[PDB]
Amino acid sequence: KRKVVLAEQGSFYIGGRTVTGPGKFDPSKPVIPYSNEGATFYINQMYVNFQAPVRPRGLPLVFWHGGGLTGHIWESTPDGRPGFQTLFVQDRHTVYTIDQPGRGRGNIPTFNGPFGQLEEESIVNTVTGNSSKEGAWVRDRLGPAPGQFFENSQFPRGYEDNYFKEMGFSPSISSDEIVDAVVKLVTHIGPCVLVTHAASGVLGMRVATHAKNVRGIVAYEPATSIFPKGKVPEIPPLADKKSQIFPPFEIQESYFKKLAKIPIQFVFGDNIPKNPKSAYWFLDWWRVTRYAHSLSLEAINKLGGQASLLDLPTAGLRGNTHFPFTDRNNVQVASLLSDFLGKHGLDQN
Amino acid sequence: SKRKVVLAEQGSFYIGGRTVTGPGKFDPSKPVIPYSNEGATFYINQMYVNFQAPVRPRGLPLVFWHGGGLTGHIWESTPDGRPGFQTLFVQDRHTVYTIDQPGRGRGNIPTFNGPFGQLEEESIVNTVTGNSSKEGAWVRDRLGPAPGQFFENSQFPRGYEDNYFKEMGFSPSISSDEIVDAVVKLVTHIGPCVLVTHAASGVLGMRVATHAKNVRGIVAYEPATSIFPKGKVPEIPPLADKKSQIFPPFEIQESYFKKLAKIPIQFVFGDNIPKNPKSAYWFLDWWRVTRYAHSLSLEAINKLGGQASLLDLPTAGLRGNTHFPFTDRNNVQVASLLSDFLGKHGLDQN
Ligand SMILES: COC(=O)c1ccccc1S(=O)(=O)NC(=O)Nc1nc(C)nc(OC)n1
Ligand SMILES: COC(=O)c1ccccc1S(=O)(=O)NC(=O)Nc1nc(C)nc(OC)n1
């Protein structure tokens, strides 16, 4: 189950821009400590890893980590079982895994001075934000409160430290520049399928509207819904009657209509309440966010699309967290992804 | 195929680090976003580790440790897309570990809710960062004497400058002790192994070896900081500008320094390091004096009974290497010299 035969593997950087400091560079003057004087800095570039099997069949898969994550989540589970990278190379697909700008091996744009500041210009904010272990525990639905598990949980218990260690902050790079890097990658790859997660859900939808090479999307628990501009439906507040889900992203209808031209599947795990749950903010947030996505998919289908919501419990898989692809039953989750690819001919040459 | 690789297994994991906490208690009924430090536990300073194991490995696993401002990418591929040392050594029948050290790449960057690096009133890392420019890296890496220029003999993959410089970035002010600690923990997990280091990780790998008997050999590509027994640093001249000095050598207690005499150690240097003072080119002159300091460090290990050597790539018949010989155009020939070192010491046999 662990063996993999690669025709080739490697990694590269793509996307990004440059910014420049003031003045000139004199190679005769001390280079350390480093200075912005005469400086060119490459910023906002993305890291890309690829592994290609012998005799690939179908389109390459581009696995795009969720918020605060890296391509690690597709390589291995926290307890060291094979991730989707290995499983899909074994399923005969070329597999690309990225670290988006601002995350992991992607660029974090900072210079000589306060974080993110190039002289007078703020490239990214000096003040950061970052979830705690406790916030991630409830966001990911391991259980209703930190340290508590749902009885049915598929989480690899005992490997909590390993799991939370994979998460971190993201600097305030604009979403436009993140989308731009992935559009450039899709242009480089050719026809492909995006497999997204959480924060990369809305970003992958945007990429597809800019890149006809995206031939399908599977999004694991996307975090932000998308609608045509001016056509956001009524979405309730949370059960606390004060909080809202993430403001839906709005795009011009001419771009939104491109989503109707490819198969799209959103995949949700378990333990999302059907009814308001004021005691558990993130559980209630997932209830309303899932509802908003159901409306987003319906809007795509009213434009002639083929956009579906797969609830893993309906497929017979119980207890999945917000990371179904690293849960204990991730092989069965992968089988459902192979099923989607096969139905839509994305596993054939 | 030159690109074909057969893995018995591959994967990645996190190791090392500690936790820090914010004040107060976490209430799951209160809005979790925007993120707060209240009731928070944060995992900080952990390291990312990737491994690829061949079918039936022969000899010790290799741990490739990137230089300053880099990541494990530099061992995966060259800027122009040729195989890196990860592929070459898996093909050479060694299990290969590649790390992103704490503060770099997939390793943790310790920041929270607040100004960068600050957890309430505690400064975990500095808010003010430092980072080289393209121009600083060009001369540090000896592509040529000035940005845009290449040495006549250059092995750099010319035309792929954008790819190359895009791989570099800043490092937060994590203590070197905590970086060493994470790698010591990895070495405990792996068992007997060989460290292959680069630039900034040179001195760190020497330190790891003094804390971890499982390090059975070191190959260091152009280490940046020299190491000596405490209060035994030899006289080292200032640079030709009569103002600058090399990096202050690291000093360790002699009982730890002596551990370096028990294992084979090779430092590898590329080309275009001047023999004589060069006041017009600061980094070239810096490399001249830094290489000299390393020659004295290796001599101090040998005087204690060690097995330390300096491999100048031009003396081995390889001309034009930069500060990254393992991604240069002749990196296959550089790899053959690493295989030679491993074979000489039996580190390629079980
Ligand atoms: C791994 O799971 C997630 O990606 C994820 C999933 C659900 C909620 C939060 C996150 S996240 O915090 O970690 N990433 C994210 O999308 N956060 C976010 N993004 C935007 C654009 N705005 C706001 O605040 C309004 N928060
Ligand atoms: C890949 O090349 C190198 O690794 C490398 C190579 C040559 C010089 C410098 C570096 S470095 O940029 O990372 N720095 C390093 O080794 N640590 C460090 N950094 C600074 C800024 N100051 C001091 O001490 C004053 N030490």
Author numbering:
A (entry chain A): 12 to 360
B (entry chain B): 11 to 360
Question: What text appears in the publication on this structure?
Answer:
SulE, an esterase, which detoxifies a variety of sulfonylurea herbicides through de-esterification, provides an attractive approach to remove environmental sulfonylurea herbicides and develop herbicide-tolerant crops. SulE catalyzes the de-esterification of a variety of sulfonylurea herbicides, such as MM, BM, SM, TM, TrM, EM, and CE, to the corresponding herbicidal-inactive parent acid. The structures show that SulE is a dimer with a lid loop in a domain-swapped β-hairpin covering the active site from the opposing monomer. SulE shows a similar catalytic triad consisting of Ser209, His333, and Glu232 at its active site.
To elucidate the catalytic mechanism of SulE, we solved the crystal structures of wild-type SulE in complex with CA, mutant S209A in complex with MM, and mutant S209A/H333A in complex with MM, SM, TM, TrM, EM, BM, and CE in the range of 1.29–1.63 Å. In the S209A-MM complex structure, clear electron density was observed for the benzene ring of MM, but the electron density for the sulfonylurea bridge and the heterocyclic ring was unclear, probably due to the considerable mobility of the flexible sulfonylurea bridge. By contrast, the sulfonylurea bridge and the heterocyclic ring of MM was clearly observed and well localized to the active site of S209A/H333A, indicating that MM binds more stably in S209A/H333A than in S209A. In the S209A-MM complex structure, the benzene ring is also surrounded by some hydrophobic residues Ile43, Ala234, Phe257, Phe293, Trp296, and Trp297. The sulfonylurea bridge also forms hydrogen bonds with two hydrophilic residues Tyr45 and Arg150, and the heterocyclic ring also forms a π-π interaction with Phe257. However, it was found that the SulE S209A and P44R/S209A mutants still retained weak activity in this study. The distance between His333 and the substrate is too long to have a direct reaction; therefore, the reason why SulE S209A and P44R/S209A mutants still retain de-esterification activity may be that a water molecule got into the active site and was directly deprotonated by His333 when Ser209 is mutated to alanine, and then as a nucleophile to attack the ester bond of the substrate.
